[PDB]
Amino acid sequence: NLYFQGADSCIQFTRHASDVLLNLNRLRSRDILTDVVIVVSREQFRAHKTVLMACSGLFYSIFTDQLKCNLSVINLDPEINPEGFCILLDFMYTSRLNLREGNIMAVMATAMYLQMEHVVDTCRKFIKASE
Amino acid sequence: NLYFQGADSCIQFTRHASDVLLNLNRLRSRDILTDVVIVVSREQFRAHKTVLMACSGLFYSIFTDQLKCNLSVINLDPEINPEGFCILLDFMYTSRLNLREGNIMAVMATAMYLQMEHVVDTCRKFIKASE
Ligand SMILES: Cn1c(=O)c2c(c3cc(Nc4ccnc(Cl)c4C#N)ccc31)N[C@@H](C1CC1)CCO2
Ligand SMILES: Cn1c(=O)c2c(c3cc(Nc4ccnc(Cl)c4C#N)ccc31)N[C@@H](C1CC1)CCO2
């Protein structure tokens, strides 16, 4: 019931990937093995570099750079809205995007900067439905 | 199409968790930001501590211990079969378990040791179907 025959030979566990992500978000909530602080304006966000790279073209580029991969603090562009970054950071660790009329422009601009392309496309579609 | 209305207010992205896990497995394949070596008998396996903790009660206990969380090399019980550990390490990063008649006893014993309880239950069910 919790597993099935995959297209390939292996048995596959249906909820495995979502349960791993839930545990990584629990580690983040408890500040366990977090290895970077992202600073956006006056706010700081602790996270795991591997989750950030897995969820963003900008962080993938930063953490694969031989000089920047060892930095413990990353400062983002001061024009980035911290609420918009917070919504996208929660999305990275949960798959859930808290998109609302009052935050959609900041979330879209932050997703463009972070290189989260399907999030940008989704924001655009929601904006287009209003116009 | 790639998203839906979650039971809660947020929109949710269907493939997000499995795509994050795919990227973490790509980082492992390329040896990027791996922070531990697990030694099983004569073999070494590089991995990310966060993925190991998220997938195992034993690694969760080790990496939350104030003394052991800083270790770069973890040596497992020499009775653990490296092929069995390799199959479970691949499962952690993919959701796919390569269970076969020739490896099921080693995979089950290694999952008991690593505290991966639904994997043990699944192994037991497959063994019971043969008897
Ligand atoms: C452009 N872009 C996205 O538009 C994007 C990304 C995204 C992720 C990456 N990282 C990688 C890519 C390839 N290979 C490796 Cl190893 C890595 C790593 N680490 C690079 C670019 C990415 N991740 C998604 C997550 C569901 C996967 C959310 C946001 O959308
Ligand atoms: C017993 N047991 C399992 O039987 C198990 C586990 C498993 C995982 C943990 N880690 C945690 C638990 C709670 N809270 C936190 Cl933060 C962490 C962490 N990190 C602890 C015990 C675990 N993970 C599954 C993965 C799909 C989640 C695969 C194997 O089955």
Residue ID of nearest Cα to ligand 1 atom 13: B23
Per the listing, tokens 């531990």 go with B36
H/E segment holding residue A96: strand A96-97
Cβ atoms within 10 Å of A108's Cβ, excluding its own: 21
How many angstroms is it from A125 CA to the middle of ligand 2? 37
- In angstroms, rounded to a whole number, what is the distance separating the alpha carbons of residues B76 and A118? 41
How buried is A9 (Cβ within 10 angstroms: 0-12 exposed, 13-18 middle, 19+ buried)?
Answer: exposed
- The verdict on a CB contact (< 8 Å) between B50 and A69 is no
For A6, the closest of B23, B64, B96 (CB atoms) is B96
- Determined by X-ray
Structural domain of B38: 1-131
Task: Count the domains in chain B.
Answer: 1
Phi and psi of B48, rounded to 5°? -100, 130
Residue A104 near residue A126 (C-beta atoms within 8 A): yes
Cβ atoms within 10 Å of A96's Cβ, excluding its own: 18
Tokens of A106: 């900041």
Ligand nearest to the CA of A116: 1
Q: Give the three-class secondary structure for B75.
A: strand
CA angle B61, B98, B79 (to 5 degrees): 50
Residue B52 near residue B63 (C-beta atoms within 8 A): yes
Choose from A95, A98, A125 for mutation: most chain B CBs within 10 A.
Answer: A95
Residue A51 near residue A94 (C-beta atoms within 8 A): no
CA angle A114, B22, B30 (to 5 degrees): 85
How many angstroms is it from A102 CA to the middle of ligand 1? 27
- In angstroms, rounded to a whole number, what is the distance separating the alpha carbons of residues A119 and A110? 10
Resolution in A: 1.8
Residue ID of nearest Cα to ligand 1 atom 21: A57
For B95, the closest of A12, A95, A96 (CB atoms) is A12
Residue ID of nearest Cα to ligand 1 atom 18: A54
For B17, the closest of A9, A21, A48 (CB atoms) is A21
